[PDB]
Ligand binder design. Structure first.
Ligand SMILES: CC(=O)N1CCN([C@H]2[C@@H]3OC[C@@H](O3)[C@@H](N)[C@@H]2O)CC1
Ligand SMILES: CC(=O)N1CCN([C@H]2[C@@H]3OC[C@@H](O3)[C@@H](N)[C@@H]2O)CC1
Length: 340
């Protein structure tokens, strides 16, 4: 490994471990913010655009209902998410600014990324050219090199979880399945189209599942649709475990070669999981034009700058039913969330 990379990752791990061992807690409260608009929803709860009443700064506030987290069996995952987010620091990761809890809910207040989800831009344009896909892929490669060096598996890569910032760079969001793992882990989680075969087959799996998901993402960016597509999950799973994929004829030979090595069903042969680790990916011919240092330093001109009017603009996010943020007069699930 290059001395620069080695000493960078050694320092990255030292800094992560100090915050991991002593997590920040209770750094704001709900009535410090005005609620503006719902930016998205899921089983996790909701994300709202908020404005800090004193500073005027905008944030994306993820709100989880403690009782629903318990019923959906996501306690450990939610504690993982907040503890990891408060400890990481990398140019292409969403930045957690505050966290707190009250009688009913857990709150993670993040810097707001007004360019919207990669998913929207991909569906609007149709597919990205190879250079455009490669610019985003390089940022994911560097982000996974960082996360994996901290013993973190991400487990939720997909276009809806990649936001585009004001400079056209990626911010990875949604650490709801991220976990610190030395060795293997066993939980079935993630979106069907992006699951590695070893997840579908209920094996103990490792960080190689993130490199499989990178293969799916690159294919989807360059084709406009994912490589394993079907109407029901059970049919998607059959395609994933088969060891066959079809590439559009417009794909370059270098892209097809990279994808055969990322979408390798045998995890012991998959790029990212060999002796050379991430360097088999960084040194692959498809990445020959990539200036890894300049990408990290955000010195490369992005292929695309999202249109938006200012830090409060919500036009790149879609419209959701607006519901109350209720806080019970009685504490719910206090024991389960003591460490949050
Ligand atoms: C940092 C920022 O600007 N964020 C945080 C994350 N959210 C969520 C929202 O909830 C579900 C859906 O939209 C999801 N794909 C998205 O990542 C968007 C706004
Ligand atoms: C029956 C149904 O599907 N509904 C009921 C009414 N809502 C409106 C109404 O206006 C303010 C508030 O109730 C909000 N929930 C929403 O916008 C749409 C969803």
């Amino acid at each position: 490994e290059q001395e620069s990379v080695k000493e960078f990752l050694a320092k990255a791990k030292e800094e992560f471990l100090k915050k991991w061992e002593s997590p920040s807690q209770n750094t704001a409260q709900l009535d410090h913010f005005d609620r503006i608009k719902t930016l998205g929803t899921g089983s996790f709860g909701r994300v709202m655009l908020v404005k800090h009443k004193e500073t005027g700064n905008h944030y994306a506030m993820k709100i989880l209902d403690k009782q629903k987290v318990v019923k959906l069996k996501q306690i450990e995952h939610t504690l993982n998410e907040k503890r990891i987010l408060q400890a990481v620091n990398f140019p292409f990761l969403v930045k957690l600014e505050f966290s707190f809890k009250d009688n009913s809910n857990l709150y993670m207040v993040m810097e707001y990324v007004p360019g919207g989800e990669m998913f929207s831009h991909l569906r609007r344009i149709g597919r990205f050219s190879e250079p455009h896909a490669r610019f985003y892929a390089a940022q994911i490669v560097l982000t996974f090199e960082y996360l994996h060096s901290l013993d973190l598996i991400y487990r939720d890569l997909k276009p809806e979880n990649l936001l585009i910032d004001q400079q056209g760079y990626i911010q990875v969001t949604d650490f709801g399945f991220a976990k610190r793992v030395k060795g293997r882990t066993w939980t079935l989680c993630g979106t069907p189209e992006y699951l590695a075969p070893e997840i579908i087959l209920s094996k103990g799996y490792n960080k190689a599942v993130d490199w499989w998901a990178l293969g799916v993402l690159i294919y989807e960016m360059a084709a406009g649709y994912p490589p394993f597509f079907a109407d029901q999950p059970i049919q998607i799973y059959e395609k994933i475990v088969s060891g066959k994929v079809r590439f559009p004829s417009h794909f370059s030979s270098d892209l097809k070669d990279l994808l055969r090595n990322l979408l390798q069903v045998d995890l012991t042969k998959r790029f990212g999981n060999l002796k050379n680790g991430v360097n088999d990916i960084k040194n692959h011919k498809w990445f020959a034009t990539t200036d890894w240092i300049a990408i990290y330093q955000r010195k490369v001109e992005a292929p695309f700058i999202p249109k938006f009017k200012g830090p409060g603009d919500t036009s790149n996010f879609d419209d959701y039913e607006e519901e109350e943020i209720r806080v019970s007069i009685n504490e719910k699930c206090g024991k389960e969330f003591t460490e949050f």
